[PDB]
Structure 1
Amino acid sequence: RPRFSFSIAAREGKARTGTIEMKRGVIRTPAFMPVGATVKALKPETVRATGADIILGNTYHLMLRPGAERIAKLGGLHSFMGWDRPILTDSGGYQVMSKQSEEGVTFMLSPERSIEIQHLLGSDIVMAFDECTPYPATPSRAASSMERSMRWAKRSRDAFDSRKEQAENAALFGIQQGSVFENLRQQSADALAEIGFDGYAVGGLAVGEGQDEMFRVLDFSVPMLPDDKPHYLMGVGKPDDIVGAVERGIDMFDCVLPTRSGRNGQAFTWDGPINIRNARFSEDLKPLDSECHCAVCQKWSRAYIHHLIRAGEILGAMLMTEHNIAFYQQLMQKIRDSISEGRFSQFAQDFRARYF
């Protein structure tokens, strides 16, 4: 397999469906990447069984303990965790800034160290070290922030390219900033493209602006990215967010909602989310969802999961989390197929009429 190849097999409007080929495996796009030294409460085989092709490696926690160098000593994150498929590592910056300088962030994490850490973990897809601009932001602060990020983008690329083994086997994504301002988004897209990356993320959204605002910015911002490269909307999100995003040209997603929300009693369904802790589910013998193909909906009822979650049982987290990650993957498959058959617009309208 090549180091990195993105091919689009079908389109409808702005939406695309296809594949990213990498040495460790093929990624079906639009893709949802579950967030992780584990994906909470799940074995990798379980994650794989749900249909995940790739997972997102939580660099900030790992960097802490057991540490990037230790994991490298132990053989890399893949071996450590037992996942042999692609891993996208974030740069550690979002969570750090959640003392700032041109060098990087003291809390010292810089683009160079960020790249080195992701290399030590053995990431397949490395993110450039950026700064997610707070919302709201004034045009000046938005610009100043973006401009620094573009500088950090160049250092990341140079850093990445300076390590032979990393450049030959991994891929590097660049991240667009510019808050909600078109001119700034364009300047950012221009800079990233001149540097050159394997993929392009849309940064700085899912920061408190709301869906209407997020979609308006995606409307002008995603066409600014190279068409022939994957488009990654960072930290999004709810089902309805992913559908609308795909409608605007996004190929990739990461979010903690399925996992976090799962342990909290929220289950995703085609008729919308439910909180299984509700008394209404105490004797409901139906599965979490009507149509879900997951193992959980195959073998346990609402009633059981309700009790487990009410009880604080670990098994509760496990089952809720497995269903939710399966549901997200099923969502992506439906997105992929509907695009493939040129029926995505209707799927997106049918999805929303039922989900809401």
Structure 2
Amino acid sequence: RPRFSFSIAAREGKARTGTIEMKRGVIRTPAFMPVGTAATVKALKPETVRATGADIILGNTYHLMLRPGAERIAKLGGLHSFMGWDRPILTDSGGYQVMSLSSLTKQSEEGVTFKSSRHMLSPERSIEIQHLLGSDIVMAFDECTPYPATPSRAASSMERSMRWAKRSRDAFDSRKEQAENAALFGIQQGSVFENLRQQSADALAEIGFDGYAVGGLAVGEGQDEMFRVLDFSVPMLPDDKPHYLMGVGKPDDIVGAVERGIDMFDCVLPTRSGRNGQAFTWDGPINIRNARFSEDLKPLDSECHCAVCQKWSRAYIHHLIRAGEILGAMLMTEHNIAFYQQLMQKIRDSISEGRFSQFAQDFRARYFA
């Protein structure tokens, strides 16, 4: 098995489908990564995550460095062994979460100091933490520019991120075992500004990465604006490497992003909203807590192939979620993650068959009916 090999099997417009081969497994693209922030995809055993179709999951440098700790996880055998997921794991670098979740932060050229306990993150420390975790796809340490931002503020922020991208590249390359067994992705910044996105793409390509994330989106800009930025931003990235849209998103966001050349996604929506009673269906989301479901014997979704829809009724799941029962969170989450994976499968198949445009149209007409 290779360290990292991306092959594009088919295209339709800007959309691509293919595979990333890595030592711990193959990732089918476009891919959705369930989020496992605290070394667990919430309410699911890893075997269940796999059974839904997931090829890779996401972990977080920020959360794990605090609890249970990076050195501790390494001492225990690495993140894969610790949580019982033996397939690829992508870890975010901490750059977004530190600014989102920390009470106090101090930003400088060196990195970010923060209070959880006082800690520091820098390109070097982030790469080392991800090494200790045993991440298969390592993200460069970046700065997610707040939205909105003035052109000048976006520029200075993006430029720092690019300097941090080079430092990330160097730290990764200095660690032989990491460079031989893992991959490193760069993160494009530049807010909503075309010239800055271009400068960022140029800087990242000059350094060279295994894949390229579009950072700084899904930060409150809304779908229209996100799509507008993707329209010009994705073509700036190297065509022959994967394109990863961080933190996206709703099913319609995913479809539109694939139409614009994105290959990889992660989002807490299916897990979090599952726990909250929202189930995804081909006819749009439903809230299972609604009284209309109290005696509904149909499964959550009429076409869904998941184990939950094969066995339990809306009425039962309605009862569980109303009662605050853990099994309710389990079943809703398994269904939602399975729904997301089936969406990705339909996307892959339709691109492979040259009918993705029709799929996107059919999907939207029904989902938003």
Residue 24 of structure 1 and its aligned partner are, at CA, apart by: 0.5
Partner of 2:71: 69
The separation in 2 between residues aligned to 1:59 and 1:197, in whole angstroms, is 19
The separation in 2 between residues aligned to 1:195 and 1:299, in whole angstroms, is 51
Which SS does the other structure have where 2:303 is aligned?
A: coil
The separation in 1 between residues aligned to 2:244 and 2:28, in whole angstroms, is 13
Deviations 1:52-81 (A, max 9, x none): 000001222111111000000000000000
**Percent of matched pairs sharing the same residue:** 100
Which stretch shifts more, 169-178 or 98-107? Answer: 98-107
Which SS does the other structure have where 2:64 is aligned?
A: helix
Residue 261 of structure 1 and its aligned partner are, at CA, apart by: 0.5
Which SS does the other structure have where 1:259 is aligned?
A: helix
Residue 225 of structure 1 and its aligned partner are, at CA, apart by: 0.2
Which SS does the other structure have where 1:126 is aligned?
A: strand
Partner of 2:6: 6
The separation in 2 between residues aligned to 1:282 and 1:117, in whole angstroms, is 47
The separation in 1 between residues aligned to 2:95 and 2:234, in whole angstroms, is 22
Which stretch shifts more, 212-221 or 95-104? Answer: 95-104
Aligned pair partner of 1:329 in 338, 341, 353: 341
Which stretch shifts more, 133-142 or 98-107? Answer: 98-107
Residue 202 of structure 1 and its aligned partner are, at CA, apart by: 0.2
Are 2:89 and 1:82 equivalent residues in the alignment? Answer: no
Partner of 1:50: 52
Which stretch shifts more, 90-99 or 187-196? Answer: 90-99
Residue 192 of structure 1 and its aligned partner are, at CA, apart by: 0.1
Residue 92 of structure 1 and its aligned partner are, at CA, apart by: 1.2
Which SS does the other structure have where 1:99 is aligned?
A: strand
Deviations 1:149-194 (A, max 9, x none): 0000000000000000000000000000000000000000000000
Which SS does the other structure have where 1:51 is aligned?
A: coil
The separation in 1 between residues aligned to 2:273 and 2:97, in whole angstroms, is 19
Residue 337 of structure 1 and its aligned partner are, at CA, apart by: 0.2
Deviations 1:278-300 (A, max 9, x none): 01101100000010000000111
Contiguous gaps of at least 5 residues in structure 2: 100-104, 115-119
Deviations 1:77-128 (A, max 9, x none): 0000001000000101211109111111110111110000000000000000
Which SS does the other structure have where 1:78 is aligned?
A: helix
The separation in 2 between residues aligned to 1:257 and 1:347, in whole angstroms, is 22
Which SS does the other structure have where 1:106 is aligned?
A: strand
The separation in 1 between residues aligned to 2:330 and 2:128, in whole angstroms, is 33
Partner of 1:196: 208
Deviations 1:205-240 (A, max 9, x none): 001110000001000000000000000000000000
The separation in 2 between residues aligned to 1:39 and 1:92, in whole angstroms, is 18
The separation in 1 between residues aligned to 2:9 and 2:328, in whole angstroms, is 39
The separation in 2 between residues aligned to 1:324 and 1:202, in whole angstroms, is 25
The separation in 2 between residues aligned to 1:298 and 1:325, in whole angstroms, is 15
Deviations 1:244-301 (A, max 9, x none): 0000000000000000000000000000000101011011000000100000001111
Which stretch shifts more, 225-234 or 51-60? Answer: 51-60
Deviations 1:29-65 (A, max 9, x none): 0000000121100000000000000000122211111
Partner of 2:108: 101
The separation in 1 between residues aligned to 2:62 and 2:337, in whole angstroms, is 22
The separation in 2 between residues aligned to 1:3 and 1:233, in whole angstroms, is 22
The separation in 1 between residues aligned to 2:310 and 2:21, in whole angstroms, is 32
Partner of 2:34: 34
The separation in 1 between residues aligned to 2:243 and 2:177, in whole angstroms, is 25
The separation in 2 between residues aligned to 1:199 and 1:174, in whole angstroms, is 7
Residue 302 of structure 1 and its aligned partner are, at CA, apart by: 0.5
TM-score by length of 2: 0.96
Partner of 1:275: 287
The separation in 1 between residues aligned to 2:201 and 2:145, in whole angstroms, is 16
Residue 350 of structure 1 and its aligned partner are, at CA, apart by: 0.1
Aligned pair partner of 2:327 in 302, 315, 319: 315
The separation in 2 between residues aligned to 1:171 and 1:43, in whole angstroms, is 26
The root-mean-square deviation of aligned C-alpha atoms, in Å, is 0.7
The separation in 1 between residues aligned to 2:197 and 2:137, in whole angstroms, is 23
Which SS does the other structure have where 1:42 is aligned?
A: coil
Which stretch shifts more, 54-63 or 32-41? Answer: 54-63
Which SS does the other structure have where 1:38 is aligned?
A: coil
The separation in 2 between residues aligned to 1:300 and 1:62, in whole angstroms, is 35
The separation in 1 between residues aligned to 2:183 and 2:312, in whole angstroms, is 40
Which SS does the other structure have where 1:135 is aligned?
A: coil
Deviations 1:297-338 (A, max 9, x none): 011110111111011101011000000000000000000000
Deviations 1:14-35 (A, max 9, x none): 0000000000100000000000
